[PDB]
Tab-separated table of C-alpha atoms and ligand atoms in Angstrom:
chain	number	residue	atom	x	y	z
A	1	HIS	CA	36.565	22.093	-91.611
A	2	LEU	CA	38.244	21.549	-94.999
A	3	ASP	CA	36.156	18.445	-95.844
A	4	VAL	CA	33.891	18.987	-98.873
A	5	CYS	CA	31.099	16.876	-100.353
A	6	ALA	CA	30.167	17.350	-104.006
A	7	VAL	CA	26.677	16.873	-105.430
A	8	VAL	CA	26.044	16.277	-109.104
A	9	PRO	CA	22.421	16.413	-110.248
A	10	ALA	CA	22.376	13.895	-113.112
A	11	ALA	CA	18.688	12.964	-113.201
A	12	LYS	CA	24.071	14.255	-122.890
A	13	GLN	CA	25.912	13.294	-119.702
A	14	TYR	CA	26.278	9.800	-121.128
A	15	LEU	CA	27.771	10.864	-124.457
A	16	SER	CA	31.484	10.088	-124.585
A	17	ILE	CA	34.697	11.968	-125.279
A	18	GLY	CA	37.717	9.687	-125.481
A	19	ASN	CA	36.307	6.391	-124.200
A	20	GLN	CA	35.142	8.197	-121.058
A	21	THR	CA	31.618	9.567	-120.565
A	22	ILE	CA	30.956	13.270	-119.979
A	23	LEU	CA	29.659	12.405	-116.511
A	24	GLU	CA	32.967	10.696	-115.717
A	25	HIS	CA	35.033	13.625	-117.027
A	26	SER	CA	32.859	15.831	-114.856
A	27	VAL	CA	33.101	13.779	-111.668
A	28	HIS	CA	36.801	13.099	-112.076
A	29	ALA	CA	37.478	16.852	-112.216
A	30	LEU	CA	35.841	17.209	-108.787
A	31	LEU	CA	37.659	14.233	-107.265
A	32	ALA	CA	40.995	15.664	-108.434
A	33	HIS	CA	40.936	18.231	-105.644
A	34	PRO	CA	42.086	16.772	-102.273
A	35	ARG	CA	39.311	18.491	-100.317
A	36	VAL	CA	36.556	16.661	-102.194
A	37	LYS	CA	36.053	13.597	-99.960
A	38	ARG	CA	32.766	12.547	-101.476
A	39	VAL	CA	30.639	12.933	-104.573
A	40	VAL	CA	26.905	12.259	-104.423
A	41	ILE	CA	25.420	11.673	-107.868
A	42	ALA	CA	21.636	11.939	-108.179
A	43	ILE	CA	20.265	9.853	-111.023
A	44	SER	CA	16.760	9.339	-112.345
A	45	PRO	CA	15.035	6.143	-111.215
A	46	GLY	CA	15.275	3.618	-114.031
A	47	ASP	CA	18.603	5.064	-115.175
A	48	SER	CA	20.373	1.810	-116.062
A	49	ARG	CA	23.511	3.345	-117.579
A	50	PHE	CA	25.186	4.657	-114.420
A	51	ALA	CA	25.508	1.227	-112.787
A	52	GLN	CA	27.581	0.099	-115.762
A	53	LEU	CA	30.161	2.856	-115.161
A	54	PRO	CA	33.267	2.596	-112.930
A	55	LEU	CA	31.826	5.403	-110.801
A	56	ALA	CA	29.277	2.892	-109.506
A	57	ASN	CA	31.873	1.099	-107.367
A	58	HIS	CA	34.075	4.042	-106.400
A	59	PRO	CA	34.585	4.276	-102.615
A	60	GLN	CA	34.098	8.055	-102.631
A	61	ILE	CA	30.966	8.026	-104.779
A	62	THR	CA	27.433	7.602	-103.462
A	63	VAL	CA	24.429	7.297	-105.766
A	64	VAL	CA	20.900	8.436	-104.899
A	65	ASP	CA	17.621	8.849	-106.784
A	66	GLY	CA	17.119	12.361	-108.107
A	67	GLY	CA	13.882	14.223	-108.739
A	68	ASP	CA	11.792	15.974	-111.383
A	69	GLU	CA	13.445	19.384	-110.989
A	70	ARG	CA	17.114	20.320	-110.566
A	71	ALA	CA	16.594	21.649	-107.036
A	72	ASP	CA	14.863	18.369	-106.253
A	73	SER	CA	17.902	16.311	-107.239
A	74	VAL	CA	20.250	18.611	-105.352
A	75	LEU	CA	18.171	18.302	-102.180
A	76	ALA	CA	18.279	14.511	-102.527
A	77	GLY	CA	22.052	14.718	-102.879
A	78	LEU	CA	22.375	16.865	-99.756
A	79	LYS	CA	20.680	14.117	-97.722
A	80	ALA	CA	23.621	11.786	-98.353
A	81	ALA	CA	26.215	14.528	-97.883
A	82	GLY	CA	26.996	13.324	-94.378
A	83	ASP	CA	28.257	15.969	-91.973
A	84	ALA	CA	30.078	17.961	-94.657
A	85	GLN	CA	30.150	21.652	-93.757
A	86	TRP	CA	30.547	22.846	-97.351
A	87	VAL	CA	28.979	21.440	-100.533
A	88	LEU	CA	30.106	21.799	-104.159
A	89	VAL	CA	27.277	21.475	-106.701
A	90	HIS	CA	28.448	20.751	-110.260
A	91	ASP	CA	26.654	20.112	-113.578
A	92	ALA	CA	26.814	16.550	-114.881
A	93	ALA	CA	27.389	17.951	-118.389
A	94	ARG	CA	30.345	20.248	-117.676
A	95	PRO	CA	33.417	18.049	-118.376
A	96	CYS	CA	35.877	20.864	-119.105
A	97	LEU	CA	36.311	22.143	-115.534
A	98	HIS	CA	39.935	23.045	-114.725
A	99	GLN	CA	41.740	22.502	-111.426
A	100	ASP	CA	42.909	26.090	-111.057
A	101	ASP	CA	39.346	27.436	-111.214
A	102	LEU	CA	38.156	24.728	-108.842
A	103	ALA	CA	40.926	25.516	-106.360
A	104	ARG	CA	40.139	29.243	-106.399
A	105	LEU	CA	36.464	28.478	-105.861
A	106	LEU	CA	37.181	26.293	-102.826
A	107	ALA	CA	39.214	29.093	-101.252
A	108	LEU	CA	35.895	30.812	-100.505
A	109	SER	CA	35.356	28.670	-97.392
A	110	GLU	CA	38.179	30.588	-95.693
A	111	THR	CA	36.913	34.079	-96.563
A	112	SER	CA	33.134	33.753	-96.914
A	113	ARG	CA	30.106	32.553	-94.954
A	114	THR	CA	27.793	32.620	-97.972
A	115	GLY	CA	29.875	30.864	-100.615
A	116	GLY	CA	30.068	31.634	-104.325
A	117	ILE	CA	30.204	30.347	-107.898
A	118	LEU	CA	32.442	30.156	-110.942
A	119	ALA	CA	31.494	32.761	-113.541
A	120	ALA	CA	32.833	34.292	-116.733
A	121	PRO	CA	32.584	38.026	-117.466
A	122	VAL	CA	30.318	39.057	-120.342
A	123	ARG	CA	32.304	40.124	-123.409
A	124	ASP	CA	29.744	40.658	-126.176
A	125	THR	CA	27.434	43.654	-126.328
A	126	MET	CA	24.065	42.562	-124.940
A	127	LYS	CA	20.622	43.562	-126.169
A	128	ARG	CA	17.264	43.337	-124.408
A	129	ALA	CA	14.464	42.544	-126.846
A	130	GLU	CA	11.087	44.224	-126.624
A	131	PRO	CA	8.416	42.086	-124.919
A	132	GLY	CA	6.843	39.757	-127.455
A	133	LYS	CA	9.046	40.396	-130.489
A	134	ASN	CA	12.511	40.342	-132.052
A	135	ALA	CA	13.069	44.100	-131.852
A	136	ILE	CA	15.802	45.689	-129.725
A	137	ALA	CA	14.407	47.565	-126.731
A	138	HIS	CA	17.811	48.777	-125.551
A	139	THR	CA	21.391	47.695	-124.858
A	140	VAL	CA	22.075	46.002	-121.520
A	141	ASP	CA	25.210	47.306	-119.790
A	142	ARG	CA	27.599	44.345	-119.862
A	143	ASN	CA	29.734	45.899	-117.134
A	144	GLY	CA	29.228	43.837	-113.995
A	145	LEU	CA	27.321	41.205	-115.967
A	146	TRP	CA	28.518	37.617	-115.619
A	147	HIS	CA	27.800	34.188	-117.093
A	148	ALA	CA	26.954	31.861	-114.178
A	149	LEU	CA	28.867	28.573	-114.367
A	150	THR	CA	29.428	25.661	-111.966
A	151	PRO	CA	30.638	24.451	-109.544
A	152	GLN	CA	28.664	26.498	-107.056
A	153	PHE	CA	30.117	26.286	-103.537
A	154	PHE	CA	28.072	26.956	-100.388
A	155	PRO	CA	27.751	25.988	-96.721
A	156	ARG	CA	25.763	22.693	-96.783
A	157	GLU	CA	22.933	23.485	-94.396
A	158	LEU	CA	22.496	27.035	-95.719
A	159	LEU	CA	22.132	25.664	-99.258
A	160	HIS	CA	19.632	23.114	-97.976
A	161	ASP	CA	17.526	25.737	-96.211
A	162	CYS	CA	17.590	28.253	-99.045
A	163	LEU	CA	16.538	25.787	-101.702
A	164	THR	CA	13.961	24.266	-99.377
A	165	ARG	CA	12.384	27.667	-98.731
A	166	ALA	CA	12.654	28.875	-102.334
A	167	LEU	CA	10.721	25.813	-103.509
A	168	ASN	CA	8.065	25.987	-100.789
A	169	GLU	CA	7.326	29.594	-101.717
A	170	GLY	CA	7.209	28.760	-105.417
A	171	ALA	CA	10.123	31.013	-106.347
A	172	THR	CA	11.670	31.048	-109.823
A	173	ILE	CA	14.861	29.033	-109.367
A	174	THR	CA	17.605	28.673	-111.977
A	175	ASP	CA	20.935	27.748	-110.378
A	176	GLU	CA	21.830	27.123	-106.732
A	177	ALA	CA	23.008	30.712	-106.376
A	178	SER	CA	19.526	31.955	-107.290
A	179	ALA	CA	18.170	30.072	-104.270
A	180	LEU	CA	20.523	31.948	-101.946
A	181	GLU	CA	19.641	35.203	-103.710
A	182	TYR	CA	15.931	34.582	-103.145
A	183	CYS	CA	16.584	34.312	-99.404
A	184	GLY	CA	18.482	37.611	-99.277
A	185	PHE	CA	22.024	36.348	-99.792
A	186	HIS	CA	24.667	37.572	-102.235
A	187	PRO	CA	27.156	34.799	-103.210
A	188	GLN	CA	30.633	35.688	-104.446
A	189	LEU	CA	31.631	35.627	-108.104
A	190	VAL	CA	34.911	33.803	-108.737
A	191	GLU	CA	36.127	34.320	-112.288
A	192	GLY	CA	36.619	31.102	-114.202
A	193	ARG	CA	37.565	30.020	-117.710
A	194	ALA	CA	34.947	30.512	-120.420
A	195	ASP	CA	35.816	27.094	-121.889
A	196	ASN	CA	33.943	25.521	-118.961
A	197	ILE	CA	30.907	24.822	-121.150
A	198	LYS	CA	27.842	22.641	-120.617
A	199	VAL	CA	27.136	20.053	-123.298
A	200	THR	CA	23.476	20.548	-124.178
A	201	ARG	CA	23.309	20.592	-127.978
A	202	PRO	CA	24.778	18.151	-130.557
A	203	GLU	CA	27.538	20.575	-131.579
A	204	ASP	CA	28.578	21.045	-127.949
A	205	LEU	CA	30.128	17.566	-127.839
A	206	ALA	CA	32.672	18.311	-130.564
A	207	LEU	CA	33.491	21.652	-128.935
A	208	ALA	CA	33.930	20.070	-125.502
A	209	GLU	CA	36.371	17.577	-127.004
A	210	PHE	CA	38.260	20.480	-128.566
A	211	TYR	CA	38.556	22.236	-125.197
A	212	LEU	CA	39.456	19.067	-123.302
A	213	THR	CA	41.925	17.802	-125.909
B	1	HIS	CA	17.214	48.715	-154.479
B	2	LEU	CA	18.930	45.374	-153.782
B	3	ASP	CA	22.471	46.816	-154.088
B	4	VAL	CA	24.405	46.652	-150.797
B	5	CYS	CA	27.739	48.143	-149.746
B	6	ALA	CA	29.639	46.563	-146.859
B	7	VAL	CA	31.892	48.455	-144.455
B	8	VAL	CA	34.540	46.745	-142.378
B	9	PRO	CA	36.207	48.846	-139.684
B	10	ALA	CA	39.729	47.387	-139.575
B	11	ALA	CA	41.678	50.307	-138.109
B	12	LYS	CA	44.183	39.991	-134.669
B	13	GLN	CA	42.625	40.628	-138.080
B	14	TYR	CA	46.000	39.842	-139.619
B	15	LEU	CA	46.491	36.508	-137.862
B	16	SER	CA	45.980	33.620	-140.271
B	17	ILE	CA	43.865	30.485	-140.447
B	18	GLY	CA	44.788	28.254	-143.369
B	19	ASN	CA	47.115	30.501	-145.376
B	20	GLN	CA	44.384	33.153	-145.432
B	21	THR	CA	44.174	36.054	-142.967
B	22	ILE	CA	41.184	36.529	-140.659
B	23	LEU	CA	40.401	39.776	-142.479
B	24	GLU	CA	40.248	37.873	-145.773
B	25	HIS	CA	38.014	35.137	-144.330
B	26	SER	CA	35.818	37.932	-143.037
B	27	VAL	CA	35.619	39.934	-146.260
B	28	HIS	CA	35.189	36.873	-148.443
B	29	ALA	CA	32.125	35.852	-146.411
B	30	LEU	CA	30.517	39.205	-147.271
B	31	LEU	CA	31.435	39.051	-150.960
B	32	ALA	CA	29.887	35.575	-151.207
B	33	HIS	CA	26.401	37.065	-151.188
B	34	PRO	CA	25.351	38.409	-154.639
B	35	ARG	CA	23.842	41.591	-153.200
B	36	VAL	CA	27.159	42.778	-151.769
B	37	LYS	CA	28.502	44.881	-154.667
B	38	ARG	CA	31.186	46.620	-152.674
B	39	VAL	CA	33.235	46.324	-149.516
B	40	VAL	CA	34.871	49.399	-148.003
B	41	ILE	CA	37.660	48.494	-145.591
B	42	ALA	CA	38.827	51.221	-143.207
B	43	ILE	CA	42.425	50.760	-142.127
B	44	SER	CA	44.656	52.730	-139.796
B	45	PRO	CA	47.088	55.119	-141.486
B	46	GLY	CA	50.498	53.467	-141.562
B	47	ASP	CA	48.926	50.011	-141.810
B	48	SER	CA	51.375	48.438	-144.266
B	49	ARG	CA	49.997	44.890	-144.143
B	50	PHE	CA	46.736	45.392	-146.045
B	51	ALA	CA	48.425	46.522	-149.272
B	52	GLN	CA	50.248	43.192	-149.382
B	53	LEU	CA	46.953	41.254	-149.417
B	54	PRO	CA	44.961	40.239	-152.531
B	55	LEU	CA	42.084	42.372	-151.239
B	56	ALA	CA	44.155	45.430	-152.156
B	57	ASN	CA	43.570	44.922	-155.888
B	58	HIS	CA	40.053	43.484	-155.812
B	59	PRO	CA	37.666	45.397	-158.111
B	60	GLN	CA	34.884	45.357	-155.505
B	61	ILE	CA	37.066	46.475	-152.604
B	62	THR	CA	37.812	50.087	-151.714
B	63	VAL	CA	40.251	51.038	-148.962
B	64	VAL	CA	40.021	54.199	-146.851
B	65	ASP	CA	41.763	55.546	-143.747
B	66	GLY	CA	39.900	54.739	-140.551
B	67	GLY	CA	39.823	56.669	-137.293
B	68	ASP	CA	40.552	56.476	-133.570
B	69	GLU	CA	37.155	55.060	-132.582
B	70	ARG	CA	35.027	52.361	-134.227
B	71	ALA	CA	32.253	54.801	-135.147
B	72	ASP	CA	34.938	56.989	-136.686
B	73	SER	CA	36.104	54.236	-139.032
B	74	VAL	CA	32.545	53.322	-139.959
B	75	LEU	CA	31.738	56.933	-140.844
B	76	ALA	CA	34.845	57.047	-143.044
B	77	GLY	CA	33.669	53.867	-144.750
B	78	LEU	CA	30.209	55.310	-145.387
B	79	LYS	CA	31.793	58.185	-147.334
B	80	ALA	CA	33.012	55.757	-149.998
B	81	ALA	CA	29.794	53.728	-149.975
B	82	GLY	CA	28.592	55.414	-153.146
B	83	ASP	CA	24.831	55.629	-153.570
B	84	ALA	CA	24.146	52.337	-151.786
B	85	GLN	CA	20.762	52.436	-150.061
B	86	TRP	CA	21.644	49.778	-147.481
B	87	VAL	CA	24.957	49.189	-145.681
B	88	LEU	CA	26.274	46.033	-143.992
B	89	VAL	CA	28.800	46.703	-141.210
B	90	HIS	CA	30.911	43.672	-140.251
B	91	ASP	CA	33.772	43.091	-137.778
B	92	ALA	CA	37.199	42.549	-139.318
B	93	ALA	CA	37.817	39.783	-136.755
B	94	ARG	CA	34.699	37.670	-137.340
B	95	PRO	CA	35.811	35.084	-139.954
B	96	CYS	CA	33.226	32.411	-139.126
B	97	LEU	CA	30.163	34.139	-140.615
B	98	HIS	CA	27.869	31.717	-142.477
B	99	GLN	CA	25.936	32.405	-145.675
B	100	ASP	CA	22.569	31.333	-144.302
B	101	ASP	CA	22.741	33.867	-141.458
B	102	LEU	CA	23.951	36.551	-143.847
B	103	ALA	CA	21.114	35.840	-146.275
B	104	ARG	CA	18.482	36.025	-143.527
B	105	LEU	CA	19.960	39.304	-142.325
B	106	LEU	CA	19.796	40.855	-145.798
B	107	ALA	CA	16.116	39.939	-146.067
B	108	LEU	CA	15.433	42.800	-143.643
B	109	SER	CA	15.594	45.374	-146.457
B	110	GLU	CA	12.282	44.015	-147.768
B	111	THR	CA	10.436	44.086	-144.433
B	112	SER	CA	12.084	46.848	-142.394
B	113	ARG	CA	12.928	50.548	-142.623
B	114	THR	CA	15.242	50.480	-139.606
B	115	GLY	CA	17.372	47.417	-140.300
B	116	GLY	CA	18.712	44.892	-137.805
B	117	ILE	CA	21.599	42.721	-136.627
B	118	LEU	CA	22.676	39.118	-136.210
B	119	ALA	CA	22.351	37.970	-132.603
B	120	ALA	CA	22.454	34.790	-130.552
B	121	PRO	CA	20.020	34.126	-127.693
B	122	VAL	CA	21.491	34.004	-124.187
B	123	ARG	CA	21.680	30.448	-122.844
B	124	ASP	CA	23.574	30.677	-119.549
B	125	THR	CA	22.058	32.058	-116.366
B	126	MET	CA	23.235	35.657	-116.017
B	127	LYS	CA	24.217	37.474	-112.838
B	128	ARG	CA	24.514	41.201	-112.174
B	129	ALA	CA	27.340	41.964	-109.756
B	130	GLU	CA	26.989	44.550	-107.025
B	131	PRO	CA	28.587	47.916	-107.879
B	132	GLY	CA	32.271	47.828	-107.017
B	133	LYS	CA	32.707	44.170	-106.074
B	134	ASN	CA	32.488	40.511	-107.082
B	135	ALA	CA	29.274	39.792	-105.178
B	136	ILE	CA	26.016	38.804	-106.889
B	137	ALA	CA	23.384	41.535	-106.693
B	138	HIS	CA	20.718	39.479	-108.457
B	139	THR	CA	20.044	37.235	-111.452
B	140	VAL	CA	19.344	38.947	-114.778
B	141	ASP	CA	16.395	37.430	-116.655
B	142	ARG	CA	17.979	35.845	-119.730
B	143	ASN	CA	14.615	35.698	-121.485
B	144	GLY	CA	14.689	38.254	-124.282
B	145	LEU	CA	18.412	38.807	-123.749
B	146	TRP	CA	20.639	38.480	-126.809
B	147	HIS	CA	24.335	38.501	-127.695
B	148	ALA	CA	24.844	41.212	-130.344
B	149	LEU	CA	26.899	39.962	-133.297
B	150	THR	CA	27.693	41.322	-136.773
B	151	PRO	CA	26.943	42.006	-139.559
B	152	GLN	CA	24.635	44.858	-138.654
B	153	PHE	CA	22.439	45.921	-141.584
B	154	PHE	CA	20.870	49.386	-141.870
B	155	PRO	CA	19.748	52.005	-144.394
B	156	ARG	CA	22.983	53.874	-145.320
B	157	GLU	CA	21.981	57.466	-144.670
B	158	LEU	CA	20.067	56.604	-141.485
B	159	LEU	CA	23.161	54.852	-140.110
B	160	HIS	CA	25.254	57.869	-141.069
B	161	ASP	CA	22.929	60.314	-139.324
B	162	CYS	CA	22.478	58.242	-136.183
B	163	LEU	CA	26.168	57.689	-135.616
B	164	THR	CA	26.921	61.297	-136.495
B	165	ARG	CA	24.426	62.556	-133.915
B	166	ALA	CA	25.343	59.990	-131.252
B	167	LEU	CA	28.978	61.103	-131.427
B	168	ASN	CA	28.223	64.833	-131.444
B	169	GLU	CA	26.149	64.444	-128.286
B	170	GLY	CA	28.832	62.342	-126.620
B	171	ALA	CA	26.649	59.253	-126.269
B	172	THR	CA	28.004	55.898	-125.092
B	173	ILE	CA	28.310	53.911	-128.319
B	174	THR	CA	29.123	50.201	-128.528
B	175	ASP	CA	27.919	48.694	-131.811
B	176	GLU	CA	26.153	50.315	-134.767
B	177	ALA	CA	22.789	49.227	-133.390
B	178	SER	CA	23.425	51.242	-130.222
B	179	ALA	CA	23.695	54.367	-132.380
B	180	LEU	CA	20.228	53.765	-133.822
B	181	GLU	CA	18.925	53.010	-130.328
B	182	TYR	CA	20.288	56.316	-129.033
B	183	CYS	CA	18.271	58.147	-131.693
B	184	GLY	CA	15.027	56.388	-130.754
B	185	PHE	CA	15.159	53.447	-133.150
B	186	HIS	CA	14.680	49.747	-132.421
B	187	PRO	CA	16.574	47.507	-134.918
B	188	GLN	CA	15.438	43.938	-135.538
B	189	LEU	CA	17.142	40.909	-134.020
B	190	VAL	CA	17.858	38.160	-136.553
B	191	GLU	CA	18.983	34.964	-134.857
B	192	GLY	CA	22.366	33.749	-136.014
B	193	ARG	CA	24.800	30.964	-135.184
B	194	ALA	CA	26.714	31.277	-131.915
B	195	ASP	CA	29.892	30.064	-133.654
B	196	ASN	CA	30.137	33.502	-135.290
B	197	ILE	CA	32.831	34.591	-132.830
B	198	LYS	CA	35.220	37.546	-132.828
B	199	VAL	CA	38.908	36.722	-132.510
B	200	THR	CA	40.165	38.976	-129.725
B	201	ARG	CA	42.234	36.756	-127.433
B	202	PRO	CA	45.059	34.284	-128.256
B	203	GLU	CA	42.841	31.239	-127.664
B	204	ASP	CA	40.185	32.619	-130.013
B	205	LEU	CA	42.342	31.857	-133.059
B	206	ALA	CA	42.420	28.111	-132.413
B	207	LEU	CA	38.677	28.117	-131.724
B	208	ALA	CA	37.917	30.065	-134.903
B	209	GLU	CA	39.891	27.506	-136.900
B	210	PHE	CA	37.870	24.756	-135.232
B	211	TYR	CA	34.589	26.414	-136.238
B	212	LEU	CA	35.749	27.226	-139.764
B	213	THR	CA	37.353	23.831	-140.385
C	301	CA	CA1	40.904	12.677	-104.912
C	302	CA	CA1	30.343	38.144	-155.019
């Protein structure tokens, strides 16, 4: 029951922070938890950097070719997830994940049949702009509004089916949770640290390093 | 026309970053722009720290007693705003404001009669929780969704009237923009840097220092 397989769609992740790549910081955070028995990393075909990393020969790491879209790479990862009952999907560019948040997320397998994700409550006042221009239409109630983060933890086959159906029906998919939502599910929100950022822009690297060390 | 009076409701701001208090970093960012001819700082009665700051004897700074609510302190500030046609309201705890953002915000007085605010576009996927629990109701479209920041720049008397009416009618007020919104106005959104954070929690101080220096 407690066995978990992680999937990291990695098809910025190769930038480094302390002689270790962001991807490695990311993957090592997952492998720190005892329940994570395997990590499947989906990389783009032609990606010649991964093979030169220590992760390439790790006994608990399996590499597979990813796809064009995020959901595509996650589905590819799920195919090498063995018989794992629960899957943990985590961003390749989120190296600041903390063990306490991860542990609280994994607890969901004992109290939920849908799974859930790490999220941070909205602090700032939010505004909805008017369609087509930079004018404020109205203020969006921030109460009950959350920033979706990762990992996202769900039963393996359910995640597979939801993302498979969402794609077939051409649904607008953002994160893994949105695939469950599209199929009528309502994943749990597990509060996590706001410093769990995704390195996407140049400045993000320096900030990630600040958070990490 | 171009004369602007700033109001800072300061009734964390006294924590320091480099031998200078957050309030000072904040106020000095406003005074850096030539158009800001005056800064009215509203402090709580009994606040004995302000008087011991250099801001207390600055020729362009006026101090007044603030109130119980934010809108209350801003209204008090507006009373000492002289005949300024446009007012710039800025958080006492936002020391990372940059001159380029400020300058672009002030340009609104030449192209708008309602004013506007500094804001950062939402990046993360947002989730709306179900009423009463930590379960995801659905994903909130982040397109056209913005993080409201400060300064907030509006015609002086209009701001006064909108906040005066909003309060009298017991409306739910968050920022100054929300007061204009309540009265049927739609302030402009001027994109600003996301590093313009408000120091509210212990960790925010270290982060602010990182952004500043
Ligand atoms: Ca391990
Ligand atoms: Ca000046």
